[PDB]
Symmetry: C5
Subunit: 346 residues, 5 copies
Amino acid sequence: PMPPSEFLDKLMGKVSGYDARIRPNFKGPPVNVTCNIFINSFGSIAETTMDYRVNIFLRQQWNDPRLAYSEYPDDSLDLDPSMLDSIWKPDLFFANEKGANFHEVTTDNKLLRISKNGNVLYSIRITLVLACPMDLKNFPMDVQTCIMQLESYGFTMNDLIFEWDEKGAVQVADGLTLPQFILKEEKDLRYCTKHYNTGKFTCIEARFHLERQMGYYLIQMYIPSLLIVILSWVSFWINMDAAPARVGLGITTVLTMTTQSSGSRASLPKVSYVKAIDIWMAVCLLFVFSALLEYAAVNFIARQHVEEMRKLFISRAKRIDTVSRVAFPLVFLIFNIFYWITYKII
Amino acid sequence: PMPPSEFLDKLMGKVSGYDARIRPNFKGPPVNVTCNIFINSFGSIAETTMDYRVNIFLRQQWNDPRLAYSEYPDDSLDLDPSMLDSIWKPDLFFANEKGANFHEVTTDNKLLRISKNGNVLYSIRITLVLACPMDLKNFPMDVQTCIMQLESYGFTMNDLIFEWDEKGAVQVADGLTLPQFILKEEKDLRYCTKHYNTGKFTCIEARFHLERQMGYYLIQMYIPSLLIVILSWVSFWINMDAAPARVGLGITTVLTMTTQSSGSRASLPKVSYVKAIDIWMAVCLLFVFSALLEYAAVNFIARQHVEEMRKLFISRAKRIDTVSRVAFPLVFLIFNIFYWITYKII
Amino acid sequence: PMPPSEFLDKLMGKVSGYDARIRPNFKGPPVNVTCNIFINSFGSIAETTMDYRVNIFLRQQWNDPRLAYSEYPDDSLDLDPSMLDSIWKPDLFFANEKGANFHEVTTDNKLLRISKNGNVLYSIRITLVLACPMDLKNFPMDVQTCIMQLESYGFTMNDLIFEWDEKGAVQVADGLTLPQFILKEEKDLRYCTKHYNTGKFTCIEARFHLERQMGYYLIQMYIPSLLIVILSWVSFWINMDAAPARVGLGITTVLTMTTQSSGSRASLPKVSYVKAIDIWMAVCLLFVFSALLEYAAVNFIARQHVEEMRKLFISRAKRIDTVSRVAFPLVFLIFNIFYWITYKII
Amino acid sequence: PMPPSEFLDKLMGKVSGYDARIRPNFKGPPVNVTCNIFINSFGSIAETTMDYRVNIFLRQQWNDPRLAYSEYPDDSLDLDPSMLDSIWKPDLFFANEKGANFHEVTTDNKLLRISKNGNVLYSIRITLVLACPMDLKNFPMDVQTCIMQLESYGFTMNDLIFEWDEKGAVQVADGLTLPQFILKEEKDLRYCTKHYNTGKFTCIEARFHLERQMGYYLIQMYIPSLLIVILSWVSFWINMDAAPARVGLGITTVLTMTTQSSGSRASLPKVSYVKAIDIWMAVCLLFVFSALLEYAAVNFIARQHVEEMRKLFISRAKRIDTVSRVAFPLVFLIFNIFYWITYKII
Amino acid sequence: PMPPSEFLDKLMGKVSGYDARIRPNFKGPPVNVTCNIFINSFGSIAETTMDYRVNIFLRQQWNDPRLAYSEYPDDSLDLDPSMLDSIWKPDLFFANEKGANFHEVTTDNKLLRISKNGNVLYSIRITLVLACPMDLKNFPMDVQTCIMQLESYGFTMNDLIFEWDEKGAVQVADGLTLPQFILKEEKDLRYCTKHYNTGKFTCIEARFHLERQMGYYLIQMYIPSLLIVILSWVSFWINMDAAPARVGLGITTVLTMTTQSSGSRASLPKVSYVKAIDIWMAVCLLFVFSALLEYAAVNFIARQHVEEMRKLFISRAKRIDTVSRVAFPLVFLIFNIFYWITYKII
Ligand SMILES: *[C@@H]1O[C@H](CO)[C@@H](O[C@@H]2O[C@H](CO)[C@@H](O[C@@H]3O[C@H](CO)[C@@H](O)[C@H](O)[C@@H]3O)[C@H](O)[C@H]2NC(C)=O)[C@H](O)[C@H]1NC(C)=O
Ligand SMILES: *[C@@H]1O[C@H](CO)[C@@H](O[C@@H]2O[C@H](CO)[C@@H](O[C@@H]3O[C@H](CO)[C@@H](O)[C@H](O)[C@@H]3O)[C@H](O)[C@H]2NC(C)=O)[C@H](O)[C@H]1NC(C)=O
Ligand SMILES: *[C@@H]1O[C@H](CO)[C@@H](O[C@@H]2O[C@H](CO)[C@@H](O[C@@H]3O[C@H](CO)[C@@H](O)[C@H](O)[C@@H]3O)[C@H](O)[C@H]2NC(C)=O)[C@H](O)[C@H]1NC(C)=O
Ligand SMILES: *[C@@H]1O[C@H](CO)[C@@H](O[C@@H]2O[C@H](CO)[C@@H](O[C@@H]3O[C@H](CO)[C@@H](O)[C@H](O)[C@@H]3O)[C@H](O)[C@H]2NC(C)=O)[C@H](O)[C@H]1NC(C)=O
Ligand SMILES: *[C@@H]1O[C@H](CO)[C@@H](O[C@@H]2O[C@H](CO)[C@@H](O[C@@H]3O[C@H](CO)[C@@H](O)[C@H](O)[C@@H]3O)[C@H](O)[C@H]2NC(C)=O)[C@H](O)[C@H]1NC(C)=O
């Protein structure tokens, strides 16, 4: 017999009237193309530009009666990736590409096989940098949901319809790990049918829940953010007579805590709303600032102190020192409870 | 009958004398091309290079009598995006491109349909990085106006005219949100007819008002910029005898405020004029510097103090301490009123 | 006779039925392609994106009976790199490309020679940026293993099989040096046969062990991380009466050590687990923090001190000063032993 | 009649012997090509790499007798930008390109019109990143001169000559503003004829004077650079008995001034010569360092002070304090005059 | 007669049997191609990636008897750069490209002329980013030697040999200046013949000595690195009774010197060996650390001081103060001599 390359020349050549500019089943029902992606590499999720780089295998399956051969004895004929400009292909595109490219390492990474009944498998490797609106109302304890939509651009709903297959619409790699987030096993599948001034177009998308790993932020901006508050608590255990001791403590600590506040949003987007890490530094900033005002109240009584009425001012300046050793270690603990409970339920 | 691919070969082939290098209605009136864009993604507005990345759908509509078919029973014939090099297309370009590229993810993102009367719709996806002169006279409270002009390069006014359509000249996406700014619903539409040494060319543009969100700057460079001034106010409530207490306070605070001034223009363009954030740090720098000179005036009187005339110098050195507790908390409030009123009207 | 260019036109032209879209030995055994790479340049191994740039010479050898000439008197015929689109080539690709490109400096860097029996050598220069999951459980003393897999995309196992040659499967350059790591002479060779929903494909890979050089981290983040602890030890040799001396020492040192902790993960990925450099700064942070609490215990006894019972409190406040000069210099040495032994065996 | 597309096929087709590989007026005088650029966008002038990005419209005009039509009734025939590979074009190139690209947004931005006498206008949009040797002998008050040369590569002087036109050789945009520098209205026009081992080639260039805007540097690195010196002057108004007051002032200020010196060359090229900003920080570093040595001379006399001879040492230690309040405020003013006069004339 | 474009069609057309896939002098001696480069732009030598960007004019000259015309009366025929795919060209490539590109600004920057005897000149503009192993054993006083090799990829030694010409093998631009380094006039020329598993290939290279300019490092990291040591010397001229004076001096200076050590390797590669700038900061770190231990020895004697034996401890605590004023100013000078002598000979 003849090889599949010469066998398909009768179906993709000048004979049989086959044209790559004509969609299958013309003047009839639209083409129902089913798609399924395979995430190979994931990560590099930046927040300054609010985008993430993904590498998926976009599989496409449809039905073309013009390529339904019945003379070849086999059931699957592989095609050279250099002959993709001869058959019709869906005009699939993403609405959040923001720059993309293919891979042509020694061969155009394309897969093309034709079944006997007319099933055509089209799998390619695409490297996308997808964008998603980052919701940072609770930055250290948020559940991001970055989606990706597959719309049409040249054909409307009556000519091309995208759908998901029931046999693993979205597969995940075996050893796919992320440096900062984690990929949940549950991925939603809903439609995203858009409507413009020209018409209506099909759209398919899949939700991806990306939960953060609190192990990183808990060590860098939570343990040092708590030890600095302890530095302001040790001033109560120091005598009220040493002026340079408690003054230098209430100033060097209250100024190095601002660096922690400025160092908590160094690589974060400039959002207007307040996040969960801005209420942890601001409240702890009040503790390192109230300790400065605490010494300002103790030193103000000692500098004012008549022999009988002045002996009570010394005890009054020391009575507040007996409560500050218990108030702040018990008030900061109350805020430490309302913080790790409200942001663990919402 | 015959499919539209073979039907349009009579209108785009060697027959009928149709050439892609000839504009419609030659030796007559110019081609009136109407355009309308659809902003899909917006943001990433940097200030060091004074540019912003945009992703729009550039729709183009004109009239070509050479493509006015009258035999096909339908009213809209879709075209393959691979056949855009056969018909005439307007030479539309932007005067502020500064690098651009198309999107060819599995298909050239182009839309092409031809009506019966000769209406040709041309919609493509372009990713532009547009530039605009940043007016930073009031940096935290400015209303930026970044525009984009669509000029001609090969045809003059007598051969190609660009205009805006009245049915939604500029559409906005449904869920288009910006991280730093906000997009106003009012967009101006005016002409930008340029004149060069070669001739005159058409030009269409649309204004985009981008108001900032003060919620970000108010927390990072306004709350810490005010608490440092309070650190210089607590020196008045400290006795005038402790030298290392008030000296270290008037130096550590006046030097950490300069870091806030240098940290306020870390990612800003090097402009010559003064902005609204440079007058907030410089005036607050005077308060943290006047407190240093305030102790220099109190300590200078105590070191100079004859038994009757010296008792008044001690009261004089304490009389200024009774006014500094009221002057600065009431003078900084006056500047706090003139600042948030002048920059809220202009 | 005729030159090899005209001699091979009979084997690569329209005659002999040779087609570049047909794999050798069709309807029979699969093509056994042996590959061997030659690493020219290596390094630039970043950790923020977890990727490294490599430049190898990908050699490919297979058997094509359709190109087995028997009339030319020579044994090796060199081919012009501009004629690679006429013969069949394996669709080799990498599963961790993440962007790649060829080199076309004055000539496409391709090697093509055909033997008499049908051996075809295919060598090209590819610049890859390969990714690997960075295991940073012990950051300064880890042995990274970055691999690279060569999979198929268009042909399954029954049509294309990749294998390694026994004569130097992976060669290393003569003067290939790395700035940070070192390349070990032992490189493992194992298979990576994947299984997808479409079928099974061949895969070959080679392990690369990249041991770090501790000479860099030992000087920058280990010598200064130890001298700061010595600054907290000198407070014991200072009299317990000078308040501003020991207070300023226990605060300026405990706050500059946090900068060393924040400066140890400035260019590191945001991992959740704790690494070996996070337990060296945190434990040393306890020493510079216990010295602050040590003075808080000595000053608390002196401020409390009845004529006979008060003379023992002065000796008690000095007895702890006689143990702190020996405890911390001997407790930090114990942690210094358990650290450099546990992380030198695992 | 026939359209210009079919009319010019007789002049650009196989007939008439017109070839795009032959320069006009062969075996005779060279082609005198006149050029004129139009700067659209300017700025982004970095100093680390010593380059600036420019966007100009390169117009080219020459004479081609082979295209001198005499049958068409019009005087200017516009050409499709897709037919630039049919006529001869000058091989113009820049000697300081360092990477460049064109703009192909929906159309190749090319202009091509042919006059009756043979005048051919060629205007294209080129985005260049031009380099210039940065002369930073006086960094805040220099007048940079970045030029751009247009050389030939394939034709020598006897075959191609570039010249400037007298009617606006270099035009400037109407609203072209720069963020840091300013563009002067005077632009020099001189030749740059080079000589290599192959021969001599034509060259045209234009000088661009880029004066800096001192409004930026005067606020960031000149006002804080002067207030720190004032902090060292207030130590003279403090009593000579307070040791921790004047010691902490002469150390915290002398160390934060080094940050201003290191912060003045953070984004500057590593040049060997000294600039005008390195002599302003180094001299001011002497003032904040002489104040430290001033207290070292006052405290050395007080610690040495026999009942009559010791009373003069106290007055001697205070006599220098009466001159330091007048010397430094009058010596720093002398350097402030010689600095803003020498660098305002050269 | 006929123009050179039509004259060379007889030598580059279907007639005469000329093929671009055949090297000259086949079945005979190899082609001796002589090359000579012309460095136009040089600099941008980074150290994090260990690469430098260069822009050279790669001239190539060989002998092709098939192009030896004898009928044209001239001696040099210029060729259009669009016809380089018709003649044979050497497959020259660099072994350290790491990404490269050509320049196509309005014309492919290629030079092609053919002599009567068969001499063919081939000059193109290539922008390379070449790599070299940075030897940083003495960072401020090293002599870097970055080379560039020109190897073959498709032809072995018996088919293509590269050589250097004796008439200026490597030329330098007239006004080529470097921001950091300097280019020496002496450039070595040696062979780099490599040997692989396939065979042996020709190779030509040229050495480039790049000496650093010490004027930059001497001001930024050598003058401030010496003044901080002077701050530790002034503590000896202060009385031994002021505790907060000498304690704060021996801590604030010893901690700001570590920033100079961390600030000396901010943009340097992470090498394991010690460089010449790491022994200048570490030794100076001992001086600012020995001054802290010097006060720890003086204060330890004063706190210990029986009426006759205690008067000698006061003199002993002051005797070391009389030697420290002379020891350190004379010991640091000894290290200052051995440093600037050992690294000025090797
Ligand atoms: C692609 O998928 C669409 C569905 O999304 C298919 O369209 C549906 O096709 C049926 C005929 O097969 C149309 O008729 C209906 O038939 C059912 C019985 O199956 C009957 O109960 C209904 O009353 C109706 O007559 C139906 O209108 C149509 N639906 C839509 C929304 O178009 C289409 O056939 C598929 N195309 C191919 C090539 O498989
Ligand atoms: C494209 O749009 C232009 C307008 O921007 C159209 O041009 C105008 O066309 C009219 C004829 O239709 C020209 O004549 C005028 O007619 C009015 C009555 O409608 C009459 O009152 C005037 O006195 C005049 O005779 C008019 O001069 C012309 N204007 C310009 C500025 O060119 C043009 O026809 C449109 N082209 C197409 C193909 O639709
Ligand atoms: C490519 O390599 C494969 C092996 O990976 C070759 O396949 C093996 O080929 C033999 C025949 O040569 C097949 O038959 C076996 O022969 C042995 C004797 O050599 C006999 O003991 C066995 O019982 C069996 O009959 C064998 O099944 C086959 N193995 C596989 C896994 O396919 C193949 O021939 C190679 N192709 C070329 C073109 O060299
Ligand atoms: C392109 O420009 C060059 C000048 O840069 C033109 O060349 C000059 O052409 C004249 C003839 O037109 C040559 O002859 C001279 O004529 C003058 C009178 O005009 C006479 O006084 C002189 O003694 C001499 O005979 C002249 O040598 C030549 N100069 C050079 C440097 O080539 C050239 O003609 C222009 N080409 C075109 C096509 O316009
Ligand atoms: C390209 O350069 C090579 C040299 O690198 C040329 O090869 C040498 O060519 C000579 C003949 O011209 C060969 O023969 C020798 O001749 C000398 C007298 O000149 C004689 O004393 C020797 O005993 C020997 O017979 C020589 O073997 C050969 N050397 C090599 C290494 O190949 C070659 O001819 C040049 N090609 C062209 C086209 O110019």
